[PDB]
C-alpha cells in the first residue's frame, strides 16, 4: 500500500496517466466507444480482450503487466435515477475489489456515468461520493481525472474539505 494513502485530481487525458494501474468507464459489451473509453482503447487496445461485462461490474485485462480495470456504470438514460444510483454505487465496489486484488499502490480513475451516460444531468457530486465510499477503505494513491476547469475546481475542493 501507499505510506500515506490520499486522493489527488488532475485535468488531463487519463491515458497519460503516472499510476500503477488504469480504470476504464467501460460500455457492457466492450466495444472502443467514445471519451474516456475511446482515449483507453487507443492507448491499450491488447486490454480489450473479452472485456465485456454487465453493468455495475469491473472486469481486469492485462496490457502487457499494465492493469485495465474496465468499470461499467450505468447510463443514466436507460435506468430511473433510483436503480442507475445503486449500479453506480456497485460498479465502483467492484473497483475497490481489484484494486485491493492486483495489489498496486496507486490507480488512476475516472467519475464514472458522468459524461455520455450521465442522461445530461451534472452527477460531478454524485459519482465522486460513490468514488469515496469504496475507494476510502483501500490504501492505494488514488488519482481522479477530469478534462473540465470547473470539474477540477470542484473536485479538489470536496477532496480537500475532508483532510
Ligand atoms: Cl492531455
Ligand atoms: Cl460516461
Ligand atoms: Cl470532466
Request: one cysteine or more; a neutral charge; proline letters at 5%.
Amino acid at each position: 500500500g501507499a505510506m500515506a494513502p490520499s486522493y489527488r485530481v488532475k485535468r488531463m487525458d487519463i491515458a497519460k496517466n503516472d499510476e500503477e494501474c488504469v480504470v476504464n468507464a467501460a460500455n457492457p459489451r466492450g466495444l472502443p466507444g467514445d471519451g474516456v473509453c475511446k482515449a483507453v482503447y487507443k492507448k491499450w487496445p491488447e486490454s480489450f480482450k473479452n472485456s465485456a461485462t454487465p453493468v455495475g461490474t469491473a472486469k481486469t485485462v492485462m496490457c502487457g503487466t499494465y492493469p485495465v480495470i474496465h468499470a461499467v456504470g450505468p447510463n443514466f438514460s436507460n435506468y430511473t435515477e433510483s436503480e442507475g444510483d445503486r449500479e453506480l454505487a456497485a460498479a465502483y465496489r467492484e473497483v475497490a475489489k481489484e484494486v485491493t486484488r492486483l495489489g498496486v499502490n496507486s490507480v488512476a480513475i475516472p467519475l464514472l456515468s458522468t459524461g455520455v451516460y450521465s442522461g445530461g444531468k451534472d452527477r460531478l457530486t454524485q459519482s465522486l461520493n460513490h468514488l469515496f465510499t469504496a475507494m476510502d477503505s483501500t490504501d492505494a494513491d488514488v488519482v481522479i481525472y477530469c478534462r473540465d476547469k470547473e470539474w477540477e475546481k470542484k473536485i479538489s475542493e470536496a477532496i480537500q474539505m475532508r483532510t
